[PDB]
Amino acid sequence: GTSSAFTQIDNFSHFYDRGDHLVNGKPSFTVDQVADQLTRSGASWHDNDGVINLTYTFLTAPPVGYASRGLGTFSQFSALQKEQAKLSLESWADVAKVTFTEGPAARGDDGHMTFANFSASNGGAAFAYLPNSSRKGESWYLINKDYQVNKTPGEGNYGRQTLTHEIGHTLGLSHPGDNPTYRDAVYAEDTRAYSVMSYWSEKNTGQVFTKTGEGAYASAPLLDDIAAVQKLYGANLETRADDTVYGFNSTADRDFYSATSSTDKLIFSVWDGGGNDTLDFSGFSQNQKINLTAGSFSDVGGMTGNVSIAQGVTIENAIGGSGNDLLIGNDAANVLKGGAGNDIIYGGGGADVLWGGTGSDTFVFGAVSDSTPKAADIIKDFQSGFDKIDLTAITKLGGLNFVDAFTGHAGDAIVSYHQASNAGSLQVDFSGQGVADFLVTTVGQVATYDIVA
Ligand SMILES: [Ca+2]
Ligand SMILES: [Ca+2]
Ligand SMILES: [Ca+2]
Ligand SMILES: [Ca+2]
Ligand SMILES: [Ca+2]
Ligand SMILES: [Ca+2]
């Protein structure tokens, strides 16, 4: 078998797997299957420049025919709503080739949107129309004494998510399915852990973002939303194409990608056009499970399934917090830092740079190709007697034969140390060709007893 450490890594890497199986009695849909689902109406704005340029107006007066809509008193968006709306608009433009410019409809634009409030509850909390309808571009928001959610939209609250959700609808995204409850969902991932378009909470799929009496809602497009809107309009590869840090010490310049306190409730899906990026969750004290796999989910900031990387995005670095975290790299050369606590770090393929941080850290290797002589990982702060290099996924617990020189026998391993440069190394000849086919270098001495195999 393998160690528990490896099993924890493997289990997490597969924890949110989607497609080809039932979950909650419903088919599990992959991101692409949901992208189709969310765009099943066939409505979209049309381009051309290969970009959809929309204009939008915060209506200052009721349109012609307004009174017939049964919405009651019309009112213009407040400055706060306009500010939040713009942030919501921006979060969509960030991921797909659609732009929103405040202004009147213009012959040069691909469509025009309108935003406004109404006071009669009968109109519903908020609503919008698909771009193929006669009321294309419109979204309306209820505000009255009995319903105040839309009066103060803000990062993380439902008021902001409503703006995001309604704009998504005006862009052509349908709600995930047609006294309905999650039981009526067409697919398993129809919850707001995967899409802001969903009516159902993340609890239905097992994620935990918050507790009773508190609201926690992604302010920006989530994993499936991004897939859906890019399917419609193409991915916007221009955004944050330089190096970007998301989370703590964020350089993403987006309120929803920023954490400044251990109590922050991050719920976001990372879209990025390139560069050398980092998910920095160093400010959290809770156990985290960070997955750098494209399209995968992470448990961040004491919550679960709240962070994800959009399909097509390569995130290279991760920094855990003070909790006992799991860090899973991808094929790229990753820099993974555990932070305090007892972490389990899995670099994956490519030559990685691993920092255990303080605590007792375990560096897991699941395949020889994870760390070869020509592309070796380096553990920058290995602490013998406390840290561990775990090769059980490879050796299946068969053990290693620690020698001073490869004898041509498979399983032979060599622990070396270079006192002058405080550099250590673990070489292994798994295949038994008489030469190392696996290599891990360290800063700090490694002893045979620090190896789990
Ligand atoms: Ca970037
Ligand atoms: Ca990158
Ligand atoms: Ca940690
Ligand atoms: Ca650590
Ligand atoms: Ca890697
Ligand atoms: Ca590696």
Short mmCIF file of C-alpha atoms and ligand atoms in Angstrom, two decimals:
data_model
loop_
_atom_site.label_atom_id
_atom_site.label_comp_id
_atom_site.label_asym_id
_atom_site.label_seq_id
_atom_site.Cartn_x
_atom_site.Cartn_y
_atom_site.Cartn_z
CA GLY A 1 0.00 0.00 0.00
CA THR A 2 0.98 3.65 0.36
CA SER A 3 1.36 5.99 3.30
CA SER A 4 -1.57 8.00 4.68
CA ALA A 5 0.19 11.12 3.48
CA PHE A 6 0.05 9.93 -0.12
CA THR A 7 -3.49 8.71 0.27
CA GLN A 8 -4.50 12.16 1.55
CA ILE A 9 -2.92 13.76 -1.49
CA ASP A 10 -4.48 11.28 -3.89
CA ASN A 11 -7.89 11.57 -2.18
CA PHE A 12 -7.83 15.32 -2.38
CA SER A 13 -6.65 15.41 -5.97
CA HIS A 14 -9.73 13.35 -6.78
CA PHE A 15 -12.15 14.75 -4.26
CA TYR A 16 -13.97 17.00 -6.66
CA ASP A 17 -13.59 14.88 -9.81
CA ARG A 18 -16.50 15.38 -12.21
CA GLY A 19 -18.16 13.45 -14.98
CA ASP A 20 -19.15 9.88 -15.76
CA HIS A 21 -20.73 8.99 -12.43
CA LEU A 22 -23.72 9.86 -10.29
CA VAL A 23 -23.51 12.21 -7.32
CA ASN A 24 -26.65 12.86 -5.26
CA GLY A 25 -28.42 10.58 -7.74
CA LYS A 26 -27.70 13.01 -10.55
CA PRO A 27 -25.16 12.82 -13.32
CA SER A 28 -21.93 14.61 -12.47
CA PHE A 29 -21.22 17.07 -15.26
CA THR A 30 -17.72 18.16 -16.17
CA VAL A 31 -16.98 21.86 -16.56
CA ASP A 32 -17.47 21.54 -20.34
CA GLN A 33 -20.76 19.74 -19.92
CA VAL A 34 -21.94 22.52 -17.62
CA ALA A 35 -20.66 25.10 -20.11
CA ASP A 36 -23.07 23.55 -22.62
CA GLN A 37 -25.81 23.37 -20.01
CA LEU A 38 -25.47 27.05 -19.09
CA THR A 39 -25.53 28.08 -22.75
CA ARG A 40 -28.37 25.78 -23.83
CA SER A 41 -30.67 28.64 -24.81
CA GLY A 42 -28.46 29.51 -27.77
CA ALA A 43 -28.80 33.25 -27.01
CA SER A 44 -25.75 35.48 -27.15
CA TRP A 45 -24.77 38.96 -28.27
CA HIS A 46 -23.34 39.00 -31.76
CA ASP A 47 -20.12 40.39 -33.12
CA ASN A 48 -16.36 41.16 -36.33
CA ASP A 49 -13.62 42.48 -34.07
CA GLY A 50 -13.71 39.12 -32.35
CA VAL A 51 -14.84 41.00 -29.26
CA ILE A 52 -18.32 41.98 -28.13
CA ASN A 53 -18.46 45.65 -27.14
CA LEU A 54 -21.54 46.44 -25.10
CA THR A 55 -22.64 49.73 -23.68
CA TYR A 56 -24.79 50.02 -20.58
CA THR A 57 -26.81 52.70 -18.87
CA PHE A 58 -28.01 53.15 -15.34
CA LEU A 59 -31.46 54.35 -16.35
CA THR A 60 -32.42 57.75 -14.96
CA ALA A 61 -36.06 57.43 -15.91
CA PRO A 62 -38.54 54.63 -16.55
CA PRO A 63 -38.55 53.47 -20.16
CA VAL A 64 -41.55 53.74 -22.39
CA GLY A 65 -44.08 51.14 -21.30
CA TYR A 66 -42.52 50.82 -17.87
CA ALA A 67 -45.73 51.17 -15.89
CA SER A 68 -47.12 48.10 -17.65
CA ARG A 69 -44.40 45.86 -16.19
CA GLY A 70 -46.09 45.85 -12.76
CA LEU A 71 -42.83 46.78 -11.04
CA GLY A 72 -44.11 49.77 -9.14
CA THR A 73 -41.88 52.73 -8.45
CA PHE A 74 -38.86 53.09 -10.67
CA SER A 75 -35.62 54.33 -9.18
CA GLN A 76 -32.13 54.89 -10.47
CA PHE A 77 -29.18 52.86 -9.24
CA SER A 78 -27.43 54.51 -6.32
CA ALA A 79 -23.71 55.27 -6.60
CA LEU A 80 -23.01 52.16 -4.52
CA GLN A 81 -24.99 49.95 -6.92
CA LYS A 82 -23.27 51.54 -9.90
CA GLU A 83 -19.88 50.92 -8.31
CA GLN A 84 -20.67 47.29 -7.55
CA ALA A 85 -22.31 46.77 -10.95
CA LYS A 86 -19.14 47.99 -12.62
CA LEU A 87 -17.09 45.57 -10.56
CA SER A 88 -19.44 42.76 -11.56
CA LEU A 89 -19.28 43.82 -15.23
CA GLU A 90 -15.51 43.92 -14.97
CA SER A 91 -15.32 40.42 -13.49
CA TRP A 92 -17.09 39.09 -16.59
CA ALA A 93 -15.01 41.17 -19.02
CA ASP A 94 -11.93 39.87 -17.25
CA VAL A 95 -12.65 36.34 -18.37
CA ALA A 96 -14.40 36.59 -21.74
CA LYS A 97 -14.02 38.75 -24.81
CA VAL A 98 -16.84 41.10 -23.94
CA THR A 99 -16.43 44.72 -22.89
CA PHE A 100 -18.88 46.99 -21.08
CA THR A 101 -18.72 50.75 -21.48
CA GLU A 102 -21.09 53.05 -19.66
CA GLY A 103 -22.98 55.16 -22.16
CA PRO A 104 -26.06 55.33 -24.42
CA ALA A 105 -26.68 52.69 -27.07
CA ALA A 106 -24.34 53.37 -29.99
CA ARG A 107 -24.33 52.23 -33.60
CA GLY A 108 -20.81 50.97 -33.08
CA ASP A 109 -21.68 48.69 -30.14
CA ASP A 110 -22.80 45.06 -30.20
CA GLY A 111 -25.62 45.58 -27.77
CA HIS A 112 -26.86 47.76 -24.96
CA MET A 113 -27.64 46.99 -21.34
CA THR A 114 -29.78 48.84 -18.80
CA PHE A 115 -29.80 48.74 -14.99
CA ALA A 116 -32.51 50.06 -12.70
CA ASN A 117 -34.49 49.41 -9.55
CA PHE A 118 -38.18 48.88 -8.95
CA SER A 119 -40.14 48.81 -5.73
CA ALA A 120 -42.98 46.29 -6.07
CA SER A 121 -42.09 42.91 -4.56
CA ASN A 122 -44.23 41.13 -7.17
CA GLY A 123 -41.44 41.77 -9.65
CA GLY A 124 -39.15 39.33 -7.86
CA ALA A 125 -35.80 39.99 -6.16
CA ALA A 126 -34.15 40.80 -9.47
CA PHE A 127 -34.41 39.54 -13.05
CA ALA A 128 -32.85 39.90 -16.43
CA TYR A 129 -33.40 38.89 -20.03
CA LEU A 130 -31.40 36.76 -22.46
CA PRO A 131 -29.69 38.60 -25.32
CA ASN A 132 -32.07 37.10 -27.90
CA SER A 133 -35.16 38.64 -26.28
CA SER A 134 -36.87 41.93 -27.03
CA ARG A 135 -35.67 43.16 -23.67
CA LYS A 136 -32.10 42.04 -24.33
CA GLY A 137 -29.54 43.66 -22.05
CA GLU A 138 -32.01 44.55 -19.32
CA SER A 139 -31.64 43.69 -15.66
CA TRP A 140 -33.89 44.93 -12.86
CA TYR A 141 -33.46 44.95 -9.10
CA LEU A 142 -36.02 45.06 -6.39
CA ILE A 143 -35.59 47.59 -3.59
CA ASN A 144 -38.23 48.27 -0.95
CA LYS A 145 -38.62 48.15 2.82
CA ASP A 146 -39.21 44.40 2.74
CA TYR A 147 -36.35 43.52 0.41
CA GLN A 148 -33.10 45.41 1.04
CA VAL A 149 -30.55 43.00 -0.41
CA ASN A 150 -30.01 45.03 -3.56
CA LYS A 151 -29.53 48.33 -1.78
CA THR A 152 -26.08 47.55 -0.46
CA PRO A 153 -24.28 45.14 -2.79
CA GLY A 154 -20.77 44.46 -1.61
CA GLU A 155 -17.96 41.98 -2.06
CA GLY A 156 -19.11 38.64 -0.78
CA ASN A 157 -22.81 39.41 -0.20
CA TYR A 158 -25.77 38.27 -2.27
CA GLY A 159 -26.44 41.78 -3.49
CA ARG A 160 -23.14 41.78 -5.39
CA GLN A 161 -23.65 38.21 -6.56
CA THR A 162 -27.08 39.19 -7.85
CA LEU A 163 -25.48 41.80 -10.04
CA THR A 164 -23.02 39.22 -11.29
CA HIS A 165 -25.71 36.60 -11.76
CA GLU A 166 -28.11 38.94 -13.60
CA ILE A 167 -25.35 40.21 -15.89
CA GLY A 168 -24.38 36.61 -16.58
CA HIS A 169 -27.99 36.06 -17.64
CA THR A 170 -27.97 39.13 -19.93
CA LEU A 171 -24.83 37.68 -21.47
CA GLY A 172 -26.61 34.46 -22.41
CA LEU A 173 -26.09 32.20 -19.41
CA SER A 174 -29.16 30.24 -18.44
CA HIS A 175 -29.83 29.11 -14.89
CA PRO A 176 -28.51 25.49 -14.51
CA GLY A 177 -31.89 23.87 -15.03
CA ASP A 178 -35.51 24.61 -15.81
CA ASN A 179 -41.35 24.44 -5.06
CA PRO A 180 -38.16 23.49 -6.92
CA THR A 181 -35.15 22.46 -4.87
CA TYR A 182 -31.75 21.01 -5.63
CA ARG A 183 -33.53 17.67 -6.06
CA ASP A 184 -34.78 19.06 -9.39
CA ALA A 185 -31.30 19.83 -10.69
CA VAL A 186 -30.28 18.25 -13.98
CA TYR A 187 -26.73 17.62 -12.85
CA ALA A 188 -24.88 17.25 -9.58
CA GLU A 189 -22.80 20.41 -9.68
CA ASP A 190 -25.78 22.73 -9.84
CA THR A 191 -24.90 24.75 -6.71
CA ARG A 192 -23.17 28.04 -6.11
CA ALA A 193 -19.86 26.31 -5.42
CA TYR A 194 -19.63 25.83 -9.20
CA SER A 195 -21.73 28.61 -10.64
CA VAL A 196 -23.20 31.92 -9.49
CA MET A 197 -26.10 31.10 -11.84
CA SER A 198 -27.27 28.34 -9.52
CA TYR A 199 -30.24 28.75 -7.19
CA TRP A 200 -28.87 26.14 -4.82
CA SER A 201 -26.39 26.45 -2.04
CA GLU A 202 -22.97 24.81 -1.94
CA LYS A 203 -24.16 22.71 0.99
CA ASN A 204 -26.01 20.51 -1.51
CA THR A 205 -22.70 19.43 -2.96
CA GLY A 206 -20.95 19.23 0.41
CA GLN A 207 -18.85 22.38 0.41
CA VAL A 208 -18.83 24.63 3.42
CA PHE A 209 -18.37 28.36 2.94
CA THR A 210 -20.09 29.70 6.01
CA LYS A 211 -22.47 28.84 8.83
CA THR A 212 -26.08 29.62 9.61
CA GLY A 213 -26.92 33.29 10.05
CA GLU A 214 -24.10 34.42 7.79
CA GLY A 215 -24.05 34.95 4.06
CA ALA A 216 -21.18 34.00 1.81
CA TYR A 217 -21.47 34.33 -1.98
CA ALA A 218 -18.87 34.44 -4.74
CA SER A 219 -18.87 37.99 -6.13
CA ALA A 220 -17.39 36.91 -9.44
CA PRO A 221 -17.92 34.23 -12.10
CA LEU A 222 -17.17 30.82 -10.73
CA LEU A 223 -15.54 27.85 -12.47
CA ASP A 224 -18.43 26.81 -14.68
CA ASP A 225 -19.51 30.41 -15.33
CA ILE A 226 -16.08 31.17 -16.75
CA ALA A 227 -16.25 28.07 -18.97
CA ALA A 228 -19.76 29.01 -20.11
CA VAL A 229 -19.06 32.63 -20.91
CA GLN A 230 -15.77 31.83 -22.69
CA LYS A 231 -17.59 29.19 -24.72
CA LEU A 232 -19.89 32.01 -25.85
CA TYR A 233 -17.38 34.76 -26.36
CA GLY A 234 -13.87 33.39 -26.17
CA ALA A 235 -11.37 33.54 -23.31
CA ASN A 236 -9.87 36.94 -22.51
CA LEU A 237 -6.18 36.03 -22.48
CA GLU A 238 -5.15 39.64 -21.98
CA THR A 239 -6.10 39.91 -18.35
CA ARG A 240 -3.49 39.60 -15.64
CA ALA A 241 -1.13 38.13 -18.22
CA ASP A 242 1.90 39.20 -16.15
CA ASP A 243 2.89 37.61 -12.81
CA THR A 244 -0.08 37.60 -10.45
CA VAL A 245 -0.53 36.73 -6.80
CA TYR A 246 -4.09 35.79 -5.73
CA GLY A 247 -5.23 35.72 -2.09
CA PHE A 248 -3.09 37.36 0.55
CA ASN A 249 -0.69 39.98 -0.81
CA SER A 250 -2.80 39.92 -3.94
CA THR A 251 -1.65 41.80 -7.02
CA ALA A 252 -4.78 40.82 -8.97
CA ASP A 253 -6.41 44.18 -8.21
CA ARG A 254 -9.84 42.59 -7.67
CA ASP A 255 -11.75 42.71 -4.42
CA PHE A 256 -12.87 39.08 -4.75
CA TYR A 257 -9.27 37.81 -5.23
CA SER A 258 -8.00 39.64 -2.19
CA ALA A 259 -7.55 38.42 1.37
CA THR A 260 -6.14 40.59 4.13
CA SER A 261 -7.39 38.74 7.21
CA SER A 262 -7.57 35.19 8.55
CA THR A 263 -11.37 35.55 8.78
CA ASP A 264 -11.77 36.38 5.06
CA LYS A 265 -14.21 34.17 3.15
CA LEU A 266 -12.75 33.72 -0.29
CA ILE A 267 -14.96 32.16 -2.91
CA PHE A 268 -13.47 32.58 -6.36
CA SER A 269 -12.38 30.88 -9.53
CA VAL A 270 -9.05 32.05 -10.86
CA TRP A 271 -8.88 33.26 -14.46
CA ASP A 272 -5.59 34.49 -15.74
CA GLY A 273 -4.00 34.88 -19.18
CA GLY A 274 -0.47 33.88 -18.27
CA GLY A 275 2.64 34.80 -16.29
CA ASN A 276 4.08 33.12 -13.21
CA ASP A 277 1.23 33.08 -10.68
CA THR A 278 0.83 32.39 -7.03
CA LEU A 279 -2.09 31.46 -4.85
CA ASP A 280 -1.03 32.97 -1.52
CA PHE A 281 -3.14 31.68 1.36
CA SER A 282 -0.39 32.29 3.89
CA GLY A 283 -2.62 34.40 6.11
CA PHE A 284 -4.95 31.58 7.03
CA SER A 285 -4.62 29.53 10.21
CA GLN A 286 -7.02 26.77 9.16
CA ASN A 287 -6.17 23.54 7.38
CA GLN A 288 -6.13 24.12 3.64
CA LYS A 289 -5.87 21.85 0.58
CA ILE A 290 -4.52 23.75 -2.40
CA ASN A 291 -4.63 22.18 -5.82
CA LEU A 292 -2.74 23.86 -8.67
CA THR A 293 -4.34 21.55 -11.22
CA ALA A 294 -6.18 23.48 -13.91
CA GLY A 295 -9.93 23.34 -13.44
CA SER A 296 -9.53 21.91 -9.92
CA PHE A 297 -10.85 22.93 -6.52
CA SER A 298 -9.10 23.78 -3.28
CA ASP A 299 -10.24 24.06 0.32
CA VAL A 300 -9.06 27.52 1.38
CA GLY A 301 -9.26 29.66 4.49
CA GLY A 302 -11.05 27.15 6.66
CA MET A 303 -13.72 26.55 4.04
CA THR A 304 -14.03 23.74 1.50
CA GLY A 305 -14.33 23.72 -2.29
CA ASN A 306 -14.29 27.52 -2.26
CA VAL A 307 -11.34 28.19 -4.55
CA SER A 308 -10.66 26.90 -8.02
CA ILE A 309 -8.50 27.47 -11.08
CA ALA A 310 -10.40 27.90 -14.33
CA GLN A 311 -9.81 25.47 -17.15
CA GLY A 312 -6.94 26.58 -19.36
CA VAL A 313 -5.14 28.39 -16.56
CA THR A 314 -1.70 27.37 -15.34
CA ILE A 315 -0.98 28.49 -11.77
CA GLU A 316 2.60 27.81 -10.75
CA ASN A 317 2.90 28.61 -7.07
CA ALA A 318 1.04 28.05 -3.83
CA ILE A 319 1.69 29.18 -0.29
CA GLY A 320 -0.24 27.57 2.52
CA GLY A 321 -1.07 29.07 5.89
CA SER A 322 -0.27 28.04 9.44
CA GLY A 323 -2.64 25.09 9.25
CA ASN A 324 -1.76 21.51 8.29
CA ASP A 325 -2.27 21.85 4.58
CA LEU A 326 -1.99 19.76 1.46
CA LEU A 327 -0.36 21.39 -1.52
CA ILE A 328 -0.63 19.79 -4.91
CA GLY A 329 1.36 21.10 -7.83
CA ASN A 330 0.77 20.40 -11.50
CA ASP A 331 3.17 19.55 -14.36
CA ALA A 332 4.88 22.91 -14.41
CA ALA A 333 7.86 23.80 -12.28
CA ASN A 334 6.06 24.79 -9.06
CA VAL A 335 7.13 26.68 -5.97
CA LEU A 336 5.12 25.23 -3.10
CA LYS A 337 5.46 26.62 0.40
CA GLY A 338 3.83 24.98 3.35
CA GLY A 339 4.06 27.75 5.95
CA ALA A 340 3.84 26.72 9.63
CA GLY A 341 1.93 23.57 10.51
CA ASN A 342 2.47 20.01 9.28
CA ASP A 343 2.02 20.04 5.57
CA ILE A 344 1.96 17.44 2.84
CA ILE A 345 3.44 18.78 -0.35
CA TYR A 346 3.18 17.05 -3.75
CA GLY A 347 5.10 18.82 -6.49
CA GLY A 348 4.00 16.58 -9.35
CA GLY A 349 5.94 16.71 -12.59
CA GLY A 350 8.50 19.30 -13.59
CA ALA A 351 11.39 20.51 -11.45
CA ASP A 352 9.81 21.94 -8.31
CA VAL A 353 10.97 24.15 -5.48
CA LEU A 354 9.47 22.98 -2.21
CA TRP A 355 9.52 24.83 1.10
CA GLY A 356 8.17 22.98 4.06
CA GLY A 357 8.23 26.03 6.28
CA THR A 358 8.41 25.48 10.05
CA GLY A 359 6.76 22.34 11.41
CA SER A 360 7.05 18.68 10.31
CA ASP A 361 6.59 18.52 6.55
CA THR A 362 6.13 15.63 4.14
CA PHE A 363 7.20 15.83 0.51
CA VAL A 364 5.24 13.27 -1.46
CA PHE A 365 6.28 11.81 -4.78
CA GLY A 366 3.82 9.73 -6.75
CA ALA A 367 5.95 8.85 -9.75
CA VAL A 368 9.61 8.59 -10.70
CA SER A 369 8.99 11.24 -13.34
CA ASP A 370 8.06 13.61 -10.50
CA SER A 371 11.70 14.21 -9.72
CA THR A 372 14.34 12.97 -12.13
CA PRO A 373 18.08 13.60 -12.25
CA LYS A 374 17.62 16.02 -15.18
CA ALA A 375 14.63 17.78 -13.55
CA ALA A 376 14.97 17.36 -9.83
CA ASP A 377 12.83 18.97 -7.19
CA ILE A 378 14.70 20.77 -4.45
CA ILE A 379 13.46 21.01 -0.90
CA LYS A 380 14.80 24.36 0.22
CA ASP A 381 14.44 23.93 3.96
CA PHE A 382 14.48 20.22 4.70
CA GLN A 383 14.70 19.49 8.44
CA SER A 384 16.06 16.01 9.11
CA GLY A 385 14.37 14.12 11.93
CA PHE A 386 11.20 16.11 11.34
CA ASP A 387 10.48 16.30 7.61
CA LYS A 388 9.93 13.29 5.40
CA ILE A 389 10.40 12.41 1.76
CA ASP A 390 7.59 9.99 0.96
CA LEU A 391 8.03 7.62 -1.98
CA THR A 392 5.42 5.08 -0.93
CA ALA A 393 3.25 5.74 -4.00
CA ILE A 394 6.21 4.57 -6.00
CA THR A 395 7.63 1.78 -3.82
CA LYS A 396 4.22 0.68 -2.57
CA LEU A 397 6.02 0.26 0.75
CA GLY A 398 8.48 -2.26 -0.66
CA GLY A 399 11.26 -0.28 1.01
CA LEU A 400 14.61 0.94 -0.30
CA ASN A 401 18.15 -0.37 -0.12
CA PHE A 402 20.35 2.44 1.16
CA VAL A 403 23.86 2.08 -0.20
CA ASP A 404 26.84 4.31 -0.98
CA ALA A 405 26.82 3.40 -4.66
CA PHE A 406 24.22 1.91 -7.02
CA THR A 407 24.67 -1.84 -7.39
CA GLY A 408 22.40 -2.26 -10.38
CA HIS A 409 19.65 -3.55 -8.10
CA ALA A 410 16.22 -1.88 -8.23
CA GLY A 411 15.32 -0.09 -5.04
CA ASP A 412 18.90 0.92 -4.28
CA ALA A 413 18.94 4.44 -2.90
CA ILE A 414 21.71 6.86 -1.98
CA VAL A 415 21.43 9.61 0.60
CA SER A 416 24.26 12.08 0.16
CA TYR A 417 25.27 15.29 1.82
CA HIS A 418 27.66 18.09 0.83
CA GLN A 419 28.70 19.77 4.08
CA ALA A 420 30.30 22.77 2.35
CA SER A 421 27.05 23.84 0.65
CA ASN A 422 24.66 22.22 3.17
CA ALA A 423 23.17 20.41 0.17
CA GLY A 424 21.58 17.00 0.53
CA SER A 425 20.23 14.57 -2.01
CA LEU A 426 18.24 11.39 -2.31
CA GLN A 427 18.97 9.43 -5.46
CA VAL A 428 17.14 6.25 -6.31
CA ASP A 429 17.43 3.63 -9.00
CA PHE A 430 13.87 2.37 -9.19
CA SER A 431 14.27 0.58 -12.48
CA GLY A 432 17.49 -1.11 -11.43
CA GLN A 433 19.61 0.10 -14.35
CA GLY A 434 22.52 0.89 -12.04
CA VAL A 435 22.07 4.63 -12.14
CA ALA A 436 19.69 7.07 -10.46
CA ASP A 437 16.39 7.56 -12.28
CA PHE A 438 14.98 9.60 -9.39
CA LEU A 439 16.64 12.52 -7.65
CA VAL A 440 15.60 15.00 -4.99
CA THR A 441 17.98 17.72 -3.76
CA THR A 442 17.67 19.52 -0.48
CA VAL A 443 19.10 22.40 1.47
CA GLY A 444 19.78 20.78 4.80
CA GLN A 445 20.84 17.22 5.49
CA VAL A 446 18.57 14.29 4.72
CA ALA A 447 18.99 10.98 6.51
CA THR A 448 17.80 7.52 5.50
CA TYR A 449 15.38 7.70 8.42
CA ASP A 450 13.71 10.78 6.81
CA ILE A 451 12.61 8.66 3.89
CA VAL A 452 9.26 6.81 3.87
CA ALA A 453 9.25 4.01 1.31
CA CA B 1 -0.91 36.23 -14.32
CA CA B 2 0.82 31.29 -14.84
CA CA B 3 0.89 25.13 6.53
CA CA B 4 5.13 23.43 7.39
CA CA B 5 5.16 20.46 -10.57
CA CA B 6 8.44 17.58 -9.48
#
